[PDB]
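Why this split exists: single-chain examples teach little about how molecules sit against one another. For that reason, every record in the complexes split bundles all components of an assembly together and asks for one structure covering all of them. Below is a record exactly as it appears in the raw files.
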Amino acid sequence: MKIDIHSHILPKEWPDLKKRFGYGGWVQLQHHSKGEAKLLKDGKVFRVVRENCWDPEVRIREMDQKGVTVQALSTVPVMFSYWAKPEDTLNLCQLLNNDLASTVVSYPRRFVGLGTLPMQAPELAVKEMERCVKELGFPGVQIGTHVNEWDLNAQELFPVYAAAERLKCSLFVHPWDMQMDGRMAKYWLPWLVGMPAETTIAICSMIMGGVFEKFPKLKVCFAHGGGAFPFTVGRISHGFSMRPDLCAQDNPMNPKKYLGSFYTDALVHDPLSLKLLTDVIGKDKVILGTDYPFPLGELEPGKLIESMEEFDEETKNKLKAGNALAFLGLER
Amino acid sequence: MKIDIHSHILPKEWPDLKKRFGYGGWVQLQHHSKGEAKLLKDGKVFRVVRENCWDPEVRIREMDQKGVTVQALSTVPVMFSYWAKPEDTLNLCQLLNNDLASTVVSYPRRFVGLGTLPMQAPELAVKEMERCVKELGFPGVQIGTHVNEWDLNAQELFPVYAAAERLKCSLFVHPWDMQMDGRMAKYWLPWLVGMPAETTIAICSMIMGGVFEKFPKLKVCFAHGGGAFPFTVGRISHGFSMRPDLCAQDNPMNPKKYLGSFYTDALVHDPLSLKLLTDVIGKDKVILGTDYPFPLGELEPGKLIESMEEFDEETKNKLKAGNALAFLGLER
Ligand SMILES: [Zn+2]
Ligand SMILES: [Zn+2]
């Protein structure tokens, strides 16, 4: 109920992409009757969205009802398209990034921009990042938990991290691209269970991969309370200690030592989980996030943090806003 | 430091299974240098185990040292063999359950048996359960978190649950046959992360699949504090409520209602995680588990429990023994 770090938005419309680029599997927007719209596989449909998902005035109203001062805006993670030709992803990223920037120009004290980047091609990613920060004025970028077969430990990605750290650019890591078929096709598991596992893998990849060691000024936030990590850190840490041969031939420091070194969003739904999240990650490093406007997110942003009779007013305020300005390097 | 619900043992020797069944993929134990054996799965040595993994005299000695009174013994999960022809698995289970039954009979005050079954052939698995419970006197069985393409919701598995329920045969679910390659082939991810995820999926499959509603008296314990479940139950519970088309099509109750309906082992490593586990699952439903003799387990069994200064004594003795006794259906 002050700043929402995790909020997704799309342009009203965009070019046909199977044409602009050639090949398929790209995602499009079809509005049938104003108020509602549909997201489409190329093949068959995969999400029914509302007016809030593209219309910034609709967004501000809802934000006024809900007490939300600013939303950090990123794209819908399905847009990442790390799987496609690189130069084509650079294109889409420019389109999405300029629309995002355009939305911030209309309401520069209600919105900020988290850019997107062609991560599968590190040096283009670097350039599109100098641009996001220095021309567009974005305070960070949103990226995926893994990039194809690369995980966030990859050496191929170190140039990007170096750049993030150079240009003071924050990173919001969003899980995406779980397994959808076979055992995971029922009960909404890729979302309910697959997303948290992707985030947990991402935190590990980075800690054990050397990233936080080789870039101590990097600002990283993970989605969904960082998945399973706050709860399974004990196991990850003890395992690092038992098999230094499987786990440390890349960075020798125990994962427990980077508690304090990264942020997570507070989208965990339960008070007991929120409490644990703050005891493990820290009161300074947890950030309110809503996943607005999707049904799986928090419906009353901050309602859970406000109900925590054990936090004091200072702590509730780091959670609703204070920690988020730190992470993005902004001022009130 | 009283009862250990989670512990594995192998026979010292077993026949060459390729020879016995006509095709490979099985594991063998080789004894080459002293106090040590190699497990090979067609090709490679994939694990080196010490004598405490097969020799009950040795286990008794370490139990004497650690203050453990009973270990509930089960085979190593790699032996589940759910992939083989249904007759051969059945043959192997009889060998392993007999070995198990022999160990137990030599020390029926220090061990209880958890048998193994040909899960991929539900009829064959009901007979072996009959035999484990009636002939062999085991209080329960150990099974995997999934059976090939089936998950714990599968209908074909239902006659098995009906058997266990009739027979007062407890179920101990252990994760296995998680992806080992690709992105999961570094930093021991399949064990640090993949295993907790497999168990979160199983708990989801059993709840949303109706299993606890169909069989209100089935008792089930899950390995490793139930994986990620206790921290991510909010997200599972909320998403269930948000998308009943995907989630409530088999069982109309929110997952939260099934808290208290199943057990988990206490193998979570940190006090904060333990405290959450019993806040969420309940003080009467967490069992001391150790994963002896593998190095990912608790090295000083009970020590995480005994260190917890918030728990009264009654609570500690529940987590150390009472809960295990209720879950197994036995007496002090
Ligand atoms: Zn999101
Ligand atoms: Zn185990």
